Structure formats: C-alpha cells, structure tokens
C-alpha cells in the first residue's frame, strides 16, 4: 500500500525504528500495564489470549502491513487481555508507546486517518465473518480463511491458485469436528494438497459460502480483490 | 451522561449541525445509498442490518446513545459495507454528517478525533470479545453477554434484583425471533436468572450471566469500569 509506506516515513521521520521478531515472539502481551500501538510492516501475527488453565484462544490474524493498538488511545488503558505473536518465520513492526503515539498523530491529519481506518477494516472484517457464519456455519467460516488466503496469497498456475505461503505458516493457521469439513472439501476437488503447496480450484464456492467476507474484501481491498475476480 | 459525547455534540452544533428526530422502523442510512455519512447517534437504541438475496433481514449489531457508526471509510468515503441502520427504540436523535465533512470536523480538534477514535476502537474489542465468548460457550454466551451489558447499561439494583429501565417492547426484540435464541433465553428465565415481575424484568443471577460471558465482561470493565464497578 501507498498508505502504508508513507506511514513508515512518517515514524521513522521521528526517529521510531523498525523492530524485527522471530516466530513464537509477543510483540505485546497481555500481562504488560503500557499499552502499545504496533505498525505490523511486514510479516505474519496472530492475536491471542490466554486463559488462567492456559487454554490459548486465537482471535484474529494480522499480516503486514496494518495497525494494532493493544490501549484505548484516550485513555491508554488496555483494550483487553492480548497478545500479539509473530507465526510467520520473521516480521518487522514499529512499536510505539501510546502516550507517544499521540504526540505524533496530533501534528499530522494524513496518517491519523489511516490508522483510523484500519480500525474500520477490523470493525467491518468483524461483522461480515459473523454474517458468514450464521448463514452457513463454520463452513463459512473456513471459506472465509481459505478465501482470504486465495486473494492475499493465491499465484496463478496450470494446477489452480498456489497459496504462496511457507510450510509451516500454513500449519500455524490450522492445517475433529474440524478436521471433517476439510476432508469433505478435497473429498469435492476446492482444494488439493500437490507439489508441497496448496491450491484452489473452485474459487466460486468459496465466494457461495463466504459471500459478505468476499463482499468485504472486495469494499476494504478492492485492488486485492481484483487480481481473482 | 458521557462528558466527551457531549463535547463532541457540542461541537457539532458549534459548527452548524442540527440534529434529526427519528422513529422506530426509519433507517437512517441504508445499504442502497451511494452517499455514505456519520453517524452521530445522541439518543435511542439501533441496530446495524443487511438484507440476502431472499430478503431476510439479519441483525448483526446493536447501538445506543451516545456512540458513532459510520457507513464509509473515512479516506476513500465508500462503503464499509451494504448495511442499514434501523431505529429500535421509540425514537432516536442523531447527527448526519456527510462522510467528506467528518474529515475537516476532526482535523481542526484533535480531543474530538480521539472520542470517534476510541469509538472505534471499542467496536473492535466488543467483536473479539463476543467471538471469544461464542467460541467458547457459542450461543448462550453471546446471550448471556448481550443481558450482561444490557443489565450494566440499565440495569437498577432493587430488592427483586436488578431492574432492567427499558420498555417491555424494546426488551423483547433485543436472525429475528429465533427459536434457538427464544429457548435460550427462556432456560435463563426457567431457571431464574432472568424474571417476570410487576410488568418489569429483573436480573436475579448476575453471576451466571458473568460466568458465561467473561470475556464481554472484561471489556465492559476495561471500556467502561465506573459503570461496571456499580453492580460488582
Ligand atoms: C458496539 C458497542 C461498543 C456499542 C454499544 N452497544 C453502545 O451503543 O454503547
Ligand atoms: C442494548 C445495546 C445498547 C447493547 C450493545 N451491545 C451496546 O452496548
Ligand atoms: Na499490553
Ligand atoms: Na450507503
């Protein structure tokens, strides 16, 4: 994105560097009192919390680049209990304490307002996977996160859509109840397991069953969605 | 009241924004209009909807006074989604502005920025933490939930439990009268969380419904832990 690497400037420009994290790494967790806003550049994280039996809920993915601020901007008080932790091998993220965070933004209107509408992205993102999943359950669900993948990371090749993603990314990203769904799927020709990669070759039932996130994508990441459609 | 929404309504009209007076039924934007706005909503209760191909109408979220729902983004002023929003409550007051105008509002006064801002930002912990209740005890979490922040919001401790100060037409609409919801709440109401009283409802288990819905219960303290604190 433009957006994006003009906002990596503008950090820099005041002297805030980049940080590099390697896979497993929190680049903010739940049990730390200053909260953070992160500018994820490049890489793969996922949100996360824990429980007291240490149960770890996954609650979101993030890729670079966007935006996750982990405090109210405000109030500087904690949104809620998360963590923030790279799954892809390496990601680079500027970390910014809020408090400073607001220095910054007050001095420049350009990229308030694409912070702000990351926070958009997330809010809509969240709503249309509900949407999804009440029309056509966790089917719409998986739907939705092969979708996605297809349009983020999808190549055209004679044998489908080649999920460029490194090996062990795609089993961060979870491959019972579960585990069915993908078998019926394969078991149909919509995705095939070849040449250590991964491919899509049904795209249009994925849309079928995931029709407000392709919606979504389409409204949030037009150009993205245009490279499958 | 909420002291940085009024500043904010303040600063609207400062500017030369009249509010508009709408009643139940009316959508003040919907998912047809090329034209995409701001949402100011002062007073009343509403919901988001969307509409399928078959013409259901599916609630997807609800909002009260005083927040901000906003149709478009606010660089590109295109849609954020095909979404109506319904007044539910009797009538509602809002402020309309256009998308283009909200920009030059918040440029020239940065506290007011920060109030839409954090609007947002807790619209986005409320989804993660109703996706992480349904995760883990699916539908009756999101349930107890929604009676978890309906009962901190209008909830009144009485000796017959919590009194929830809402009209009994607005508490029962609160997938429209789905026979899984239906049956979920009425287990609530058969095993006397939630009651029938002298032409109100009062919430006589407030435990079970935190139980259930933890993790709306942390974001109802983190976002607002002074009403929180007032039934804890
Ligand atoms: C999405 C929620 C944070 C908004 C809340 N229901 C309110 O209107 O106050
Ligand atoms: C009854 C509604 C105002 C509740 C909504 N989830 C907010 O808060
Ligand atoms: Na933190
Ligand atoms: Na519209």
Do not use: H
């Given at each position: 994105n433009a957006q994006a690497e003009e906002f990596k400037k503008y950090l820099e420009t005041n002297g805030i560097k980049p940080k590099q994290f390697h896979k497993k790494e929190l680049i903010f967790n739940q049990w730390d009192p200053?909260?953070?806003?992160?500018?994820?550049?490049?890489?793969?994280?996922?949100?996360?919390?824990?429980?007291?039996?240490?149960?770890?809920?996954?609650?979101?993915?993030?890729?670079?680049?966007?935006?996750?601020?982990?405090?109210?901007?405000?109030?500087?008080?904690?949104?809620?209990?998360?963590?923030?932790?790279?799954?892809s091998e390496q990601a680079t993220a500027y970390v910014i304490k809020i408090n400073e965070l607001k220095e910054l933004l007050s001095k420049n209107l350009t990229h308030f307002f694409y912070v702000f509408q990351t926070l958009q992205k997330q809010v809509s993102y969240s709503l249309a996977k509900f949407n999804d999943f009440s029309i056509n359950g966790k089917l719409g669900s998986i739907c939705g996160q092969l979708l996605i993948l297809t349009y983020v990371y999808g190549k055209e090749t004679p044998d489908g859509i080649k999920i460029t993603l490194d090996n062990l990314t795609m089993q961060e990203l979870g491959y019972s109840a579960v585990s069915r769904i993908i078998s019926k799927l394969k078991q149909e020709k919509v995705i095939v397991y070849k040449n250590?990669?991964?491919?899509?070759?049904?795209?249009?039932?994925?849309?079928?069953?995931?029709?407000?996130?392709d919606e979504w994508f389409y409204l949030a990441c037009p150009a993205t969605w245009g490279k499958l459609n």
């Open positions: 200053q909260e953070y806003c992160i500018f994820l550049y490049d890489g793969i994280t996922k949100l996360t919390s824990i429980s007291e039996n240490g149960t770890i809920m996954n609650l979101q993915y993030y890729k670079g680049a966007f935006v996750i601020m982990s405090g109210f901007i405000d109030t500087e008080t904690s949104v809620g209990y998360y963590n923030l932790e790279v799954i250590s990669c991964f491919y899509v070759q049904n795209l249009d039932y994925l849309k079928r069953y995931a029709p407000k996130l």
